[model samples]
Target: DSKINIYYGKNYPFLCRTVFNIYQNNIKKKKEICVNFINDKTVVEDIKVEFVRNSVTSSDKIFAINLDFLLKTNLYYFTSENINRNIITNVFFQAQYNEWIDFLRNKDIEKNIIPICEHINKHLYLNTFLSFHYLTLSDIYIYYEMHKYFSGNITTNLKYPKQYKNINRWFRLIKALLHDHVATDAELIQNLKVKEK
Candidate 1:
């Protein structure tokens, strides 16, 4: 159930590729899957409604995608009445803005860098909508190891200890899923071509 995704002004190529790889390799069990394309200039509200409607009506057990920023804003702020079964994959973490910039500058200077840290700040944002939009049966979790790779002192150094609940919830669920061997998330991200075969 892939939706035709129209390319907007800026689509992160690496993220898109990685996401596709994850989906294709991991999410083979689901009957219905969707990836929607929007005319880049469409009203943000309209785009949000379209995704929300599709998400609620989807018959399958799982869904995933990297939707637009404006659409994300509208969906997170409004549509509280609708039951949301979704998890967001955040890109980067940093305690201070200048610190992140400094880190990026230094890393960018290094010739052998992997480009993982550079990728997050240039592309991702930090907010409630980006992280911790979870419920009991449905939950969202960030990859702290992944985050630490980009933001040095975030989780590893315990800069934001207040986020522990969100941290524990995501970590435990991810561990449980891996323990039980849930493959969809891994499959979907790999499908995006961001990860290896």
Candidate 2:
């Protein structure tokens, strides 16, 4: 049968909880997942728990996210012999980029998808603002992405972009759960083979 695959890098601290919540909170979106292990044990376990929790919440439906990062599961690393770092890097960048692009599309209004900011305005609580609006997993991804890049290569600021005001309000809460501990520097910092190459 055909299935969707969600490949997550290893030691993803923030992603673990965020992904789990997505599936748990949205029953309709909970069925697409196929877990695969790429590498690194410690990292995989934490996220695996996340996967399991959400799966159970979904009544054990066919829902699971793969862990593909620093280690290997199929007798070879996901980024092993046949793969090139540049290719892997490009794939990640493109996937992430497209996620954001889709987020922008949601705000188009022309599309049936609700405009995030506007949706927030309509459904937000009396005192609530953008931060409380239901955000997509991809929107959260951008937060970490900015933290990954704008952090001056610190590996885990997870606090910059506070000037985003409304965006900041939302991210700040995500920060409470993820904080500065979620990022794996091996991928975000030291893993860089070239300085802006």
Candidate 3:
């Protein structure tokens, strides 16, 4: 099989793996595989899609470049369906890649993640969407990263914490957008619980 192997941790270049998988899923491609360089080295005829943890680029840089690749190469996948080149280009550009490489580096719950999520909530509070009033890669990248922290806090779905009403709404939107592969609310809930790989 001429399969695209995603040499990812069960979790992904820490987390970059998921972004690629999620991005591919939108295009109907699923990156999968693990290769242990056991023979000292055996380059399998120019293989690719490895989710690097410590390799060539910035942690976020690996993410940045591949995202650029996915969007540009897999044009008809995520955004060709979003359907407008300008929508895709600008929205992908709109993500604060530089800031994320810095600000999103650590999960400083109190000092970082919490404050930033709340800040984005304020933006969500103000805007109908994260970029161009459409589902952009900006929202996709962050929303996938976001599930880890927000899930338990929103356990019941009965009442969203009052502070992030709009952010939570956006969360749900992106969640369904990316997680459209499953069915039933219960299954979706279980899917999140399933360990990533």
Query: What TM-score goes with each of the models?
Result: 0.25, 0.30, 0.56
Candidate 2 regions off by >4 Å?
1-34, 39-99, 102-132, 149-163, 177-197
Top-scoring candidate (TM-score): 3
Two-way TM-score contest, 1 vs 3, winner = 3
What lDDT tens digits, residue by residue, belong to model 3 across residues 1-197? 12233332223232334444444455664243222211113333222354443232234334444554553423222334344456556446545444554556646543565587767888787776665556554665566566665554445433434456777788888767655433233433444566321
Ranking by lDDT: 3, 2, 1
Better structure of 1 and 2 per TM-score = 2
Q: How well is each residue in 1-197 modelled by candidate 1, as lDDT tens digits?
A: 43534332222222232234334444454343455443355333122214432433210111222322222312122213223422322222212322333444435322523354333333333422222443211122223223333222434434322333344334444445333323444533333333221
lDDT of 3 at 59: 40
What is the Cα root-mean-square deviation between model 3 and the actual structure? 7.7
Per-residue lDDT tens digits for candidate 2, residues 106-181, read 2533243224434432433342322212333334454543344334454443333332345445445555544333
**lDDT assessment of candidate 3:** 0.48
**TM-score of predicted structure 1:** 0.25
List the global CA lDDT of all models: 0.32, 0.36, 0.48
How much does candidate 3 score in TM-score? 0.56
> Candidate 3: which stretches are off by over 4 Å?
1-3, 13-61, 64-95, 152-160, 182-191, 194-197
Q: lDDT score of model 2?
A: 0.36
Candidate 1 deviant stretches above 4 angstroms = 6-75, 81-141, 144-169, 174-182, 189-197
